[PDB]
Design a binder for this molecule. Structure first.
Ligand SMILES: [K+]
Ligand SMILES: [K+]
Ligand SMILES: [K+]
Ligand SMILES: [K+]
Ligand SMILES: [Mn+2]
Ligand SMILES: [Mn+2]
Ligand SMILES: [Mn+2]
Ligand SMILES: [Mn+2]
Lengths: 199, 199, 199, 199
């Protein structure tokens, strides 16, 4: 089997004025596309190296596998985490978990914003679920290091803070992007991911 | 003493069409400015922590010091490494060193381009001088990790491959930026840095 | 200030048979002593670099500062975390927190053992307190990276899993060391550290 | 394929008094054996993950693959780099390369000793061959990160500076171990590895 670029679940201009059409089109059709293709190339090289017992070759392929693999994992989640129907607050058990674990929805937003603003260089802020503790948890990841593969936490909501995710529109002012993105968070999707972790 | 933002040695539009005016203005007046200011803040916090023997506080400040400090170091070099009078090939002893160490000027360009294109996420490609071996050396650095502070190599020529260095103009196509930047390399400056390493 | 090697709170053979006297003597009088001495040297170099605005020099000193500084921080806590009168289970609010956060004392032991066994290369397992969440948390740290300086978690109980902490007695069998050390945990000290986090 | 633990090319006590028999026996029959066994387990898990397109699982397996795989790579080279008939200086083209690249054999020894002493935590010092530059190069690697897999340099001579490589005999005094090991370097093997890089 081969990994493929998932279609975007909405039109490229559906998240304006929060994230512009040019960004969405580049981000999906150029950036994610590249990760998917380079992941498939890397996986094939890895299969050859594994079959030959070439451990040196396997290890040389790790950065490309984590980078492109992580890129595919993260952006596949990210597109579903956004929606033109998004924004506002979550409801039901996710909201209850947020209040219990972070005090309030606004305190939660502050913590995820702070983690996302705090990434030095390229990376991601995440709300995840800690299976072992049975509660929510915030973490930041560098580059395309994916949340579950590197920490064990199950991803619920990711915020891409690579410059490509915002620069054309917001330039250097990452906090303006982080303010805007709250308006398009697909809480339906984040709730679905959360409910799949429980039971 | 306090670190300060060096003036750009040319006008913001001096490197068009290779690097556009909007990029130069943002990169110098917003990005580098931020690094300089946050470096001075970090250094003052470090001086307090040192005076108190607060080792925990010193260690907590390391990421900000490397990031903002490195940002200041790297961009201060980068502005002088470019010029509207740049491009072409170097001459004299630098050219002789390039031919001796890399075979030819074009082979050297291939290696520095490859290191620069190869940065996954944010970072820099460098031509440096290895004092101990007495020859040239190429290295890549992540984020704002500066060359001399992290490797001991003396920086001669740096290529910023953070998305902010090219994205407004070249979008995702980093190789187009790397082709363009060869036209504005200030070989006079790179030669001056090289000659200061010898003797 | 000049950092100093804290006196051990018991004699070198007080933790026998669980950690032998030769290990305790080497670990305190050679390993920790070296961290203290090299920390003082590094801090003086940093003071000179700061006074000169030498950011390159500050950054070059970071590995020595984190390693020796972290070494001092970690081992100063570690000695107080152990006692000849230790072992068994904690009581009062710490025990209540352990049961609440990890299910039971035995489940907690399993998780901290697993984190400590899981360190590949040199490092530490920690029980810490997350100030922001107001609960207990287990984390692992590489090398001498200290818990609070690198994660913000307040250290309560640390387990050194550098080979020097066990190798003379247990050789490669780190799990035997981790089983043994439970017999000398100073729960009085861990409780004091925990109570200082609350209120 | 199933990786296997290579036989040692001499008996466990053949490198006495420089590295004692207990160390060699533990290092080969326990440490390297564990890397081989855990590598085979990890490779099988990776084959399942690859067949399923489970990229998360592939990425979660990277630390075990690099650690155990790197451990296998590094120690397989290390055993052949030592010999009871070793020590003294190399001859022929390797000696000429050492003199050309480092000034002299004694200056080379100083640099490889310094790189090996300089490892903070667990790792290796290496003399390698840079294929691209066509000359010798010294590098250090953390943990079990292997030289060729992580840097592209071809390994010629490795020095293990994990505490398990010396602690039973030399305790904390790593420099005494590094002085001793020069007496058992198998220059015949290092020459064979060097000659395979050329032509
Ligand atoms: K629209
Ligand atoms: K907007
Ligand atoms: K112009
Ligand atoms: K152009
Ligand atoms: Mn992205
Ligand atoms: Mn920049
Ligand atoms: Mn220790
Ligand atoms: Mn070893």
């Amino acid at each position: 089997m081969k990994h493929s670029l998932p279609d975007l679940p909405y039109d490229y201009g559906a998240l304006e004025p929060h994230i512009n059409a040019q960004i969405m089109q580049l981000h999906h059709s150029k950036h994610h596309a590249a990760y998917v293709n380079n992941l498939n190339v890397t996986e094939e090289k890895y299969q050859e190296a594994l079959a030959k017992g070439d451990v040196t070759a396997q290890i040389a392929l790790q950065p490309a596998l984590k980078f492109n693999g992580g890129g595919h994992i993260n952006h596949s989640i990210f597109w579903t985490n956004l929606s033109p129907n998004g924004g506002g607050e979550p409801k039901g058990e996710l909201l209850e978990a947020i209040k219990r674990d972070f005090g309030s929805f606004d305190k939660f937003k502050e913590k995820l914003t702070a983690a996302s603003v705090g990434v030095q260089g390229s990376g991601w802020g995440w709300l995840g679920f800690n299976k072992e503790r049975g509660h929510l948890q915030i973490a930041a990841c560098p580059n395309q290091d994916p949340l579950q593969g590197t920490t064990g936490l199950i991803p619920l909501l990711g915020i891409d803070v690579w410059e490509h995710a915002y620069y054309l529109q917001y330039k250097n002012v990452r906090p303006d992007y982080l303010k805007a993105i709250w308006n398009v968070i697909n809480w339906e999707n984040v709730t679905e991911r959360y409910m799949a972790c429980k039971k």
